Amino acid sequence: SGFRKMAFPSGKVEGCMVQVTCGTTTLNGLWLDDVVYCPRHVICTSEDMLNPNYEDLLIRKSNHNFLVQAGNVQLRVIGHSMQNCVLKLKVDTANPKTPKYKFVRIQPGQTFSVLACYNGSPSGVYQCAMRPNFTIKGSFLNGSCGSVGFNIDYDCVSFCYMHHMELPTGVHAGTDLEGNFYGPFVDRQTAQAAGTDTTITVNVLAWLYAAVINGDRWFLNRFTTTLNDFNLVAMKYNYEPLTQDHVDILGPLSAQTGIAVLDMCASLKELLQNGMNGRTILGSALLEDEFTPFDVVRQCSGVT
Amino acid sequence: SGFRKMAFPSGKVEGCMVQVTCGTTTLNGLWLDDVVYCPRHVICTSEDMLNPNYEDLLIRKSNHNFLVQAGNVQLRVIGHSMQNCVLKLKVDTANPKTPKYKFVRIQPGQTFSVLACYNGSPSGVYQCAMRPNFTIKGSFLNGSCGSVGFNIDYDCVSFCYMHHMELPTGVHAGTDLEGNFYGPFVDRQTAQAAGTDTTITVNVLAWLYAAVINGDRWFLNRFTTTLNDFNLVAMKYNYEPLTQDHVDILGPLSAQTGIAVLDMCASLKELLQNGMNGRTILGSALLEDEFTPFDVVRQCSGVT
Ligand SMILES: O=C(Cc1cccc(Cl)c1)Nc1cncc2ccccc12
Ligand SMILES: O=C(Cc1cccc(Cl)c1)Nc1cncc2ccccc12
């Protein structure tokens, strides 16, 4: 029993973290096989960041300008290339600690763990969701760039995020491991609109199922609703519209608890319309949307 | 910017996890140097758990009855001993992945990371506080026994908790690494009173300082209070009384923000008396007490 905002064990990713320095800028890099991946803005100074011409800034750099250090050991850089907003530094040594890995582009609403790093050294690990507007509400300071987000399936690390920037609003933006930003963001020091965000409805329903499994049942009611009716309420409260694909993913939790998905939607409907009334669910006084249906089942039934 | 319930990177602890089997019971063990530490109830069956005579149950076991497996490799057990509620299994091989480590007994109100494990395999990592009543509100299922709690100071792992039991209330109890339970708990399947719990006042104040640092300032007011006055309010709301030692630990956060500790107590006083008014602080709709003053500074200023 109990339900926590649990992250994947970070060991496999800690083994991949390196420090990358170019000029006077230092950030984190990800060393997988004989390649180190890092944000391309490692080649910028603060004067360059208003609107960098990355192709021109990179032409001024040679392999020997990229200093890569894995703890204490120095890596020899034998190639460099820019792919979208990431640099790929070919090194002469394959990382002996490279786990089995994949590069994936996650969908908005999915969750992942972040290993926050500074100077190539891991500082902490936390779990978060990719917002529907493609920002992440992380915890990052200057020098965290290059820290990565990931999921783990037994022995396989699926890397999904590399941290690049903090928007003036204090929320975070970054790329997949091919350097494509999630959302409309660009790697420039400009004010950039993050879209209207919404609450991840399928995750709130998953978390209500986790609450029932863990004994928090006070919000269950005598009602039911329809997808149509529920979606009018989702609209009013800035929740993602629920689809049959969401109801289908909630199937296992519905079977586990014996609570039909639309009956749980009627509980969510009443909580949106009436609030928590000074009560809590799984130690939260708000509706939590950072656990997917997969996360709840993994946490409540067990997977290593 | 941003503030998350951040855990320490778990890699150093993942390298120490093993599976321990005795008879038909399997749980997790911690392999440090040539010793494996695990809950002594690995020697019990379900018939034994109502009131085990641990000394007699252990006399029936020999070194060859304790099966220890580190991933795939089998460890040869050359000694066994019970110390309080833990078993220490001497193995013929020192763990090559033993980090620099210490065994510490944490105080109530302090925080630590938990690496939840099943069958010697890490499943996830989360941060939590040792409650003032010596329970932990973890997330654990059957087979999680032997999972450990820890803190990390650069390269040193200070192990503070080994998980033993889930109380009928769904909260968790365990021991320090010498096998002494935190709190009044005993390793028996009986209903056991956990004391009256309280909210960790110094941690709520630390988290209000983290909120101000991160831009959440709405709760700051024109008032101040005294330790005496604040403690009357702490009493009414089941908060730990604040002492000068707590005010002293909050010194760095007070200097960082320029907000005197007693002025922040007056903000906490008004939040206790008036509630959040449907507002949030650092994404929470309740007052958070799982971040110590050290955690806030480590997270807001940066340490690896
Ligand atoms: O935002 C950046 C640098 C940058 C600037 C403009 C564009 C790009 Cl691509 C990168 N760094 C930081 C990333 N996370 C958190 C931060 C917290 C405080 C200060 C900087 C922080
Ligand atoms: O409680 C125990 C076993 C036990 C019983 C009595 C006394 C002692 Cl010392 C140990 N296991 C579990 C530990 N955490 C979480 C659990 C969740 C579900 C089931 C068992 C769980």
XYZ file of C-alpha atoms and ligand atoms in Angstrom:
650
model
C 0.000 0.000 0.000
C 0.903 3.632 -0.409
C 1.281 5.645 -3.593
C 4.273 7.835 -4.324
C 5.568 9.940 -7.210
C 8.074 7.256 -8.036
C 10.928 7.587 -10.481
C 12.760 4.777 -12.273
C 16.063 3.743 -10.634
C 18.625 6.143 -12.212
C 21.777 3.976 -12.135
C 21.720 3.039 -15.780
C 21.526 6.732 -16.734
C 24.100 7.933 -14.139
C 26.666 5.749 -15.955
C 26.096 7.786 -19.150
C 26.510 11.289 -17.765
C 29.517 13.373 -18.794
C 30.505 17.048 -18.630
C 30.875 18.896 -21.948
C 32.749 22.213 -22.133
C 33.128 24.402 -25.176
C 34.783 27.755 -24.705
C 33.468 29.051 -21.386
C 30.197 27.087 -21.401
C 29.840 23.817 -19.506
C 26.801 21.570 -19.532
C 25.921 17.871 -19.375
C 26.296 15.307 -22.141
C 24.912 11.758 -22.587
C 27.594 9.206 -23.556
C 26.098 6.171 -25.292
C 28.397 3.824 -27.257
C 31.033 6.118 -28.884
C 28.819 9.218 -29.121
C 28.183 12.049 -26.656
C 24.921 13.946 -27.107
C 24.459 17.438 -25.682
C 22.462 20.663 -26.335
C 23.971 22.589 -29.233
C 23.948 25.832 -27.179
C 27.151 24.597 -25.446
C 28.861 26.435 -28.389
C 27.323 29.819 -27.367
C 28.420 32.646 -25.144
C 25.728 34.837 -23.393
C 26.175 37.474 -26.182
C 25.240 34.765 -28.762
C 22.054 33.560 -26.987
C 19.683 36.453 -28.110
C 19.604 34.856 -31.648
C 22.482 32.450 -32.292
C 23.476 31.504 -35.792
C 24.301 27.947 -34.752
C 25.768 26.881 -38.118
C 28.255 29.790 -38.043
C 29.079 29.346 -34.364
C 29.788 25.627 -34.964
C 32.017 26.302 -37.996
C 34.388 28.138 -35.609
C 34.749 24.957 -33.471
C 37.006 21.973 -34.000
C 36.931 18.539 -32.305
C 39.678 19.664 -29.840
C 37.455 22.577 -28.605
C 34.902 20.140 -27.129
C 36.188 18.992 -23.753
C 34.407 15.881 -22.563
C 35.099 14.475 -19.161
C 33.507 11.347 -17.680
C 34.063 11.846 -13.992
C 37.838 12.016 -14.050
C 38.622 10.423 -17.435
C 38.992 12.662 -20.465
C 37.393 11.579 -23.764
C 39.096 12.133 -27.109
C 36.696 13.786 -29.612
C 37.171 12.510 -33.163
C 34.066 14.013 -34.841
C 31.287 16.519 -34.288
C 27.939 17.173 -35.917
C 24.821 19.128 -35.262
C 21.427 17.333 -35.679
C 18.560 19.747 -35.103
C 19.281 21.290 -31.577
C 21.755 18.636 -30.396
C 25.417 18.127 -30.977
C 26.768 14.635 -31.469
C 30.424 14.323 -30.476
C 32.013 11.128 -31.743
C 34.547 9.895 -29.178
C 37.268 7.284 -29.640
C 35.954 5.106 -26.752
C 32.587 3.385 -26.358
C 31.076 3.954 -22.905
C 31.610 0.706 -21.002
C 28.518 1.511 -18.938
C 26.202 1.960 -21.990
C 22.939 0.275 -21.073
C 20.564 -1.255 -23.677
C 18.806 1.869 -24.912
C 16.420 3.434 -27.412
C 15.621 7.012 -28.401
C 11.881 7.697 -28.299
C 9.709 10.755 -28.833
C 7.070 10.673 -26.090
C 3.560 11.913 -26.486
C 2.118 14.777 -24.411
C 0.545 13.329 -21.253
C 3.149 10.577 -20.920
C 5.468 10.507 -17.891
C 9.214 10.022 -17.417
C 11.983 10.292 -14.876
C 14.549 13.093 -14.996
C 18.093 12.722 -13.721
C 19.053 16.320 -12.928
C 22.791 16.825 -13.414
C 25.352 19.602 -13.039
C 28.923 19.426 -14.434
C 28.299 15.843 -15.557
C 27.431 14.797 -11.981
C 23.984 13.515 -11.038
C 22.243 15.589 -8.333
C 18.768 14.015 -8.070
C 15.953 12.119 -9.747
C 12.260 12.995 -10.022
C 9.235 11.935 -12.005
C 7.195 14.275 -14.150
C 4.739 14.446 -17.070
C 5.239 16.005 -20.501
C 2.442 18.671 -20.320
C -0.197 18.718 -23.100
C 1.479 22.025 -24.139
C 4.908 20.262 -24.437
C 6.562 21.968 -21.457
C 7.746 20.156 -18.353
C 7.423 21.565 -14.864
C 10.879 20.391 -13.785
C 13.329 21.470 -11.145
C 16.399 22.777 -12.904
C 19.050 25.419 -12.327
C 21.731 26.943 -14.599
C 24.055 24.174 -15.774
C 21.270 21.530 -15.802
C 21.174 21.617 -19.641
C 21.867 18.228 -21.084
C 20.132 16.403 -18.174
C 17.870 13.697 -19.627
C 14.429 12.231 -19.172
C 13.831 8.527 -19.630
C 11.717 5.450 -18.961
C 13.031 1.899 -18.273
C 11.521 -1.400 -19.496
C 13.420 -4.101 -17.514
C 16.978 -3.521 -18.876
C 16.140 -1.054 -21.696
C 16.425 2.702 -21.200
C 14.199 4.684 -23.525
C 15.572 8.213 -23.547
C 12.864 10.736 -24.382
C 14.040 14.152 -23.237
C 17.143 16.311 -23.081
C 16.812 19.534 -21.127
C 17.608 22.769 -22.957
C 15.906 25.803 -21.540
C 13.924 27.494 -18.846
C 11.237 29.812 -20.172
C 10.684 33.181 -18.445
C 7.602 31.578 -16.820
C 9.851 29.126 -14.923
C 8.741 26.083 -16.893
C 11.077 23.954 -18.978
C 11.612 23.100 -22.608
C 13.732 20.542 -24.305
C 14.170 18.101 -27.122
C 13.966 14.435 -28.022
C 17.422 12.758 -28.425
C 17.457 13.693 -32.142
C 17.375 17.355 -31.079
C 13.819 18.162 -32.091
C 12.118 20.409 -29.544
C 8.888 19.283 -27.943
C 6.459 22.105 -28.641
C 7.049 25.357 -30.501
C 10.238 26.266 -28.676
C 13.461 27.484 -30.145
C 16.891 27.570 -28.470
C 17.093 31.378 -28.102
C 16.831 33.756 -25.181
C 13.451 35.179 -26.164
C 10.029 35.215 -24.473
C 8.217 32.265 -26.097
C 4.548 31.446 -25.776
C 3.846 27.964 -24.356
C 0.369 26.939 -25.480
C -2.732 26.820 -23.263
C -2.124 23.849 -21.028
C -4.768 21.344 -19.962
C -5.092 18.695 -17.206
C -4.364 15.124 -18.407
C -7.801 13.584 -17.816
C -6.842 9.937 -18.389
C -4.061 10.333 -15.746
C -6.391 11.880 -13.160
C -8.748 8.916 -13.704
C -5.811 6.523 -13.354
C -4.817 8.219 -10.084
C -8.437 7.967 -8.787
C -8.208 4.223 -9.514
C -4.866 4.166 -7.557
C -6.697 5.908 -4.691
C -9.465 3.254 -4.625
C -6.828 0.449 -4.714
C -5.053 2.118 -1.767
C -8.210 2.588 0.339
C -9.045 6.254 -0.391
C -12.687 5.781 -1.469
C -14.643 8.786 -0.111
C -15.075 10.372 -3.586
C -16.908 7.333 -5.049
C -20.553 8.151 -5.610
C -23.915 6.650 -6.786
C -23.649 8.272 -10.244
C -22.580 7.547 -13.733
C -22.075 9.765 -16.798
C -21.498 9.480 -20.585
C -18.375 10.459 -22.564
C -20.438 13.350 -23.988
C -21.622 14.668 -20.648
C -18.225 14.201 -19.020
C -16.569 16.045 -21.927
C -18.834 19.113 -21.373
C -17.460 19.209 -17.786
C -13.872 18.555 -19.049
C -14.270 21.561 -21.367
C -15.444 23.865 -18.541
C -12.580 22.800 -16.275
C -9.750 22.808 -18.895
C -9.344 19.032 -18.900
C -8.368 17.024 -21.963
C -11.464 15.517 -23.701
C -11.738 11.804 -22.886
C -11.835 9.429 -25.836
C -12.596 5.695 -26.191
C -8.811 5.144 -26.570
C -8.435 6.631 -23.026
C -11.289 4.454 -21.689
C -9.575 1.425 -23.330
C -6.214 2.180 -21.625
C -8.125 2.424 -18.308
C -9.543 -1.121 -18.862
C -7.095 -2.917 -16.551
C -7.743 -0.476 -13.683
C -11.478 -0.761 -14.262
C -11.222 -4.565 -14.075
C -9.011 -4.420 -10.963
C -11.463 -2.323 -8.989
C -14.719 -3.369 -10.635
C -15.485 0.367 -11.173
C -16.668 1.086 -14.719
C -14.694 3.881 -16.379
C -17.792 6.060 -16.814
C -18.691 5.607 -13.137
C -15.184 6.866 -12.238
C -15.773 9.778 -14.701
C -18.898 10.623 -12.655
C -16.726 10.717 -9.511
C -14.250 13.010 -11.331
C -17.171 15.135 -12.583
C -18.406 15.694 -8.986
C -14.869 16.485 -7.725
C -14.459 19.081 -10.536
C -17.832 20.648 -9.800
C -17.581 20.560 -5.983
C -13.863 20.534 -5.141
C -12.273 18.356 -2.460
C -14.252 19.957 0.423
C -11.030 20.197 2.503
C -10.396 16.463 2.058
C -7.404 14.672 0.520
C -6.810 11.804 -1.937
C -3.484 9.913 -1.672
C -2.026 12.798 0.344
C -2.957 15.407 -2.254
C -5.468 18.241 -1.906
C -5.719 18.630 -5.727
C -6.421 16.285 -8.628
C -3.134 14.706 -9.684
C -2.375 14.152 -13.391
C 1.270 12.945 -13.375
C 0.552 9.204 -13.228
C -0.482 7.367 -16.387
C -2.622 4.212 -16.275
C 0.606 2.200 -16.902
C 2.336 3.926 -13.978
C -0.515 3.084 -11.615
C -0.551 -0.609 -12.533
C 3.270 -0.825 -12.363
C 3.214 0.795 -8.908
C 0.155 -1.088 -7.502
C 0.836 -4.596 -8.822
C 4.658 -4.502 -9.097
C 7.306 -4.544 -11.986
C 11.233 -4.510 -11.667
C 13.368 27.257 -11.059
C 10.827 24.638 -10.133
C 10.633 22.511 -7.008
C 10.163 18.762 -7.071
C 10.086 15.904 -4.569
C 13.556 14.893 -5.625
C 15.318 11.708 -4.634
C 19.066 11.069 -4.599
C 20.389 9.243 -7.695
C 19.954 5.528 -6.786
C 22.832 3.967 -8.764
C 25.145 3.509 -5.828
C 22.401 1.633 -3.949
C 21.195 -0.415 -6.975
C 24.688 -1.977 -7.068
C 24.148 -3.326 -3.523
C 20.780 -5.004 -3.978
C 20.530 -8.793 -3.818
C 17.739 -11.353 -3.413
C 17.737 -13.428 -0.211
C 15.703 -16.646 0.025
C 15.303 -18.822 3.074
C 12.883 -21.703 2.843
C 9.930 -20.360 0.869
C 10.430 -16.683 1.756
C 12.230 -14.304 -0.593
C 13.052 -10.687 0.131
C 15.765 -8.121 -0.602
C 19.212 -7.920 0.959
C 21.879 -5.164 1.001
C 25.360 -6.423 0.029
C 28.107 -4.161 1.372
C 31.707 -5.461 1.478
C 31.407 -9.199 2.370
C 28.145 -8.914 4.332
C 24.512 -9.105 3.211
C 21.979 -7.419 5.487
C 18.296 -8.349 5.368
C 15.183 -8.415 7.630
C 15.335 -11.368 10.005
C 11.748 -12.379 9.088
C 13.163 -13.999 5.901
C 13.479 -17.089 8.206
C 9.681 -17.175 8.864
C 6.760 -18.874 7.216
C 3.244 -17.227 7.420
C 2.386 -19.610 10.338
C 5.417 -18.197 12.259
C 4.553 -14.488 11.759
C 1.786 -14.204 14.500
C 4.595 -14.295 17.178
C 7.884 -15.702 15.880
C 10.511 -16.994 18.239
C 13.326 -15.688 16.053
C 16.160 -17.281 18.064
C 14.571 -20.745 17.706
C 13.666 -20.251 14.053
C 17.273 -19.200 13.294
C 18.779 -22.184 15.149
C 17.062 -24.425 12.556
C 18.934 -22.624 9.715
C 22.440 -23.203 8.429
C 24.559 -21.033 6.090
C 23.533 -23.222 3.082
C 19.799 -22.452 3.725
C 20.312 -18.753 2.891
C 20.284 -18.384 -0.882
C 21.752 -15.078 -1.973
C 21.721 -14.081 -5.583
C 23.145 -10.850 -7.011
C 21.355 -10.586 -10.310
C 22.559 -13.834 -11.820
C 25.602 -14.607 -9.641
C 25.151 -16.796 -6.586
C 26.898 -15.805 -3.334
C 28.455 -18.374 -1.015
C 27.299 -17.828 2.608
C 30.040 -18.541 5.146
C 28.411 -17.117 8.315
C 25.112 -15.865 9.677
C 24.087 -13.816 12.682
C 21.086 -11.987 13.955
C 21.573 -8.396 15.287
C 18.309 -7.020 16.643
C 15.774 -7.441 13.688
C 18.353 -7.911 10.915
C 20.308 -10.874 9.727
C 23.904 -10.441 8.661
C 25.022 -13.080 6.164
C 28.784 -13.193 5.746
C 29.610 -14.037 2.124
C 32.937 -15.166 0.680
C 33.068 -12.256 -1.835
C 33.158 -8.510 -1.197
C 30.686 -6.616 -3.396
C 32.775 -4.990 -6.124
C 30.143 -2.256 -6.386
C 30.255 -1.342 -2.640
C 30.129 2.438 -2.489
C 31.682 4.476 0.373
C 28.985 4.107 3.012
C 27.906 4.684 6.602
C 25.061 3.359 8.740
C 23.136 6.175 10.422
C 20.050 6.368 12.612
C 18.029 9.331 11.336
C 15.933 11.557 13.498
C 12.156 11.920 13.067
C 11.470 14.764 10.620
C 14.538 14.011 8.501
C 14.120 12.904 4.874
C 15.635 10.137 2.742
C 15.298 8.363 -0.565
C 13.910 4.834 -0.816
C 14.918 2.391 -3.525
C 11.914 0.057 -3.673
C 13.007 -3.435 -4.709
C 11.427 -6.818 -5.393
C 13.416 -10.081 -5.750
C 16.666 -8.121 -5.453
C 15.715 -5.950 -8.456
C 15.177 -2.205 -8.144
C 11.686 -1.044 -9.202
C 11.672 2.688 -8.365
C 12.982 5.514 -6.215
C 11.075 8.100 -4.176
C 11.744 10.616 -1.451
C 9.989 10.623 1.890
C 10.228 11.823 5.508
C 10.561 9.749 8.677
C 7.280 10.840 10.410
C 7.499 12.290 13.952
C 5.767 9.017 15.009
C 8.565 6.930 13.345
C 6.453 5.507 10.510
C 7.060 6.212 6.841
C 4.288 6.717 4.328
C 6.019 4.684 1.615
C 4.852 2.811 -1.430
C 5.585 -0.846 -0.868
C 4.062 -4.187 -1.801
C 4.695 -7.758 -0.573
C 8.319 -8.667 -1.270
C 9.563 -5.071 -0.758
C 11.089 -6.041 2.631
C 14.774 -5.359 2.695
C 14.453 -2.263 0.433
C 16.537 0.553 1.942
C 16.362 4.254 2.626
C 19.440 6.426 2.303
C 20.984 9.855 1.814
C 24.115 10.658 -0.274
C 26.860 13.193 0.559
C 28.936 13.437 -2.675
C 30.276 9.828 -2.856
C 29.123 8.593 0.591
C 25.877 6.667 1.028
C 24.432 6.955 4.509
C 21.977 4.094 4.872
C 19.278 4.914 7.410
C 16.352 2.581 6.817
C 15.569 -1.013 5.929
C 11.933 -1.783 5.225
C 10.289 -4.495 7.323
C 6.559 -4.170 7.616
C 3.308 -2.625 6.570
C 0.996 -1.853 9.470
C -2.744 -2.569 9.095
C -3.176 1.207 8.578
C -1.148 1.015 5.334
C 1.841 2.897 6.712
C 5.323 1.429 6.965
C 7.766 0.442 9.657
C 11.364 -0.536 9.552
C 14.753 -0.461 11.164
C 18.125 1.247 11.067
C 20.905 -0.932 9.505
C 21.718 -2.390 12.956
C 18.180 -3.815 13.033
C 16.692 -1.504 15.632
C 13.138 -0.502 14.741
C 12.267 3.160 14.432
C 9.357 3.638 16.811
C 7.640 1.083 19.026
C 7.222 -1.539 16.329
C 7.959 -5.205 16.550
C 8.375 -7.669 13.664
C 5.111 -9.584 14.261
C 1.793 -9.748 12.467
C -0.160 -7.874 15.130
C -2.107 -4.591 15.130
C 0.411 -2.078 16.531
C -0.326 1.465 17.598
C 1.731 4.110 15.751
C 1.847 7.213 17.934
C -0.082 10.441 17.301
C 1.660 11.959 14.326
C 2.372 15.659 13.868
C 3.298 17.936 10.922
C 7.044 18.741 10.714
C 6.875 22.510 11.260
C 10.498 23.324 10.389
C 10.017 21.506 7.022
C 6.811 23.382 6.180
C 8.691 26.641 6.874
C 11.568 25.439 4.693
C 9.110 24.648 1.883
C 7.501 28.133 2.233
C 11.015 29.563 1.782
C 11.401 27.315 -1.350
C 8.088 28.754 -2.595
C 9.306 32.366 -2.174
C 12.608 31.499 -3.955
C 10.583 29.985 -6.823
C 8.189 32.946 -7.181
C 5.148 31.677 -5.230
C 4.727 34.662 -2.872
C 0.956 35.197 -2.426
C 0.959 33.876 1.184
C 3.475 36.493 2.431
C 1.755 38.992 4.682
C 2.332 42.215 6.736
C 2.541 40.299 10.044
C 5.003 38.841 12.420
C 4.633 36.540 15.444
C 6.683 35.201 18.403
C 7.801 31.600 19.047
C 5.271 31.548 21.917
C 2.336 32.777 19.874
C 3.223 30.595 16.897
C 3.499 27.556 19.194
C -0.090 28.108 20.485
C -1.214 27.858 16.819
C 1.125 24.847 16.216
C -0.538 23.116 19.182
C -4.074 23.723 17.840
C -3.145 22.444 14.379
C -1.047 19.389 15.447
C 2.249 20.876 14.286
C 5.568 20.228 15.996
C 6.481 23.085 18.422
C 9.138 25.325 16.857
C 12.341 25.779 18.828
C 15.342 28.129 18.477
C 17.288 25.137 17.052
C 14.672 25.035 14.214
C 14.921 28.823 13.696
C 18.748 28.426 13.593
C 18.569 25.704 10.885
C 16.285 28.052 8.889
C 18.984 30.806 9.040
C 20.357 30.240 5.526
C 16.873 30.353 3.959
C 16.050 33.456 5.973
C 19.235 35.133 4.703
C 18.565 34.035 1.106
C 15.116 35.585 0.990
C 15.550 38.377 3.526
C 12.393 37.067 5.299
C 12.886 36.774 9.062
C 11.949 33.338 10.395
C 9.231 34.754 12.662
C 7.732 36.691 9.740
C 7.526 33.391 7.802
C 5.936 31.825 10.951
C 3.267 34.562 10.729
C 2.612 33.530 7.108
C 2.339 29.876 8.234
C 0.076 30.956 11.119
C -2.354 32.662 8.676
C -2.311 29.658 6.288
C -3.139 27.321 9.230
C -5.941 29.571 10.439
C -7.403 30.408 7.003
C -6.438 27.538 4.686
C -5.203 27.970 1.116
C -8.458 29.605 -0.119
C -8.415 27.346 -3.227
C -4.887 28.507 -4.093
C -1.691 26.473 -4.504
C 1.956 26.719 -3.382
C 4.586 24.928 -5.523
C 1.831 22.844 -7.131
C 0.432 21.675 -3.799
C -2.960 22.492 -2.287
C -1.748 21.509 1.230
C 1.196 22.466 3.425
C 4.114 20.209 2.527
C 6.418 18.870 5.269
C 8.695 16.416 3.388
C 11.504 18.864 2.583
C 14.018 19.786 5.276
C 15.855 23.128 5.259
C 18.931 21.243 3.901
C 16.853 19.733 1.086
C 15.552 23.140 0.030
C 19.013 24.717 -0.131
C 20.459 21.677 -1.959
C 17.618 21.848 -4.501
C 17.520 25.682 -4.914
C 21.248 26.465 -4.982
C 22.625 23.157 -6.344
C 24.815 20.207 -4.979
C 26.026 16.997 -6.916
O 17.765 28.335 -20.013
C 18.956 28.061 -19.849
C 20.035 28.559 -20.792
C 19.473 28.897 -22.152
C 19.007 30.175 -22.442
C 18.334 30.432 -23.629
C 18.122 29.410 -24.546
C 18.616 28.151 -24.257
Cl 18.369 26.850 -25.391
C 19.300 27.889 -23.091
N 19.419 27.383 -18.784
C 18.662 26.899 -17.700
C 17.950 25.708 -17.760
N 17.140 25.260 -16.796
C 17.018 25.999 -15.698
C 17.688 27.227 -15.487
C 17.555 27.992 -14.298
C 18.230 29.173 -14.152
C 19.039 29.654 -15.174
C 19.181 28.951 -16.342
C 18.526 27.704 -16.529
O 4.447 -6.546 6.169
C 5.023 -7.364 5.449
C 5.386 -8.753 5.937
C 5.485 -8.805 7.443
C 4.378 -9.111 8.228
C 4.433 -8.986 9.610
C 5.602 -8.555 10.225
C 6.703 -8.282 9.434
Cl 8.184 -7.745 10.180
C 6.665 -8.419 8.065
N 5.298 -7.142 4.151
C 4.976 -5.991 3.407
C 5.746 -4.836 3.449
N 5.427 -3.690 2.840
C 4.300 -3.657 2.135
C 3.420 -4.755 1.990
C 2.229 -4.702 1.218
C 1.418 -5.799 1.116
C 1.734 -6.975 1.783
C 2.867 -7.060 2.549
C 3.758 -5.959 2.662
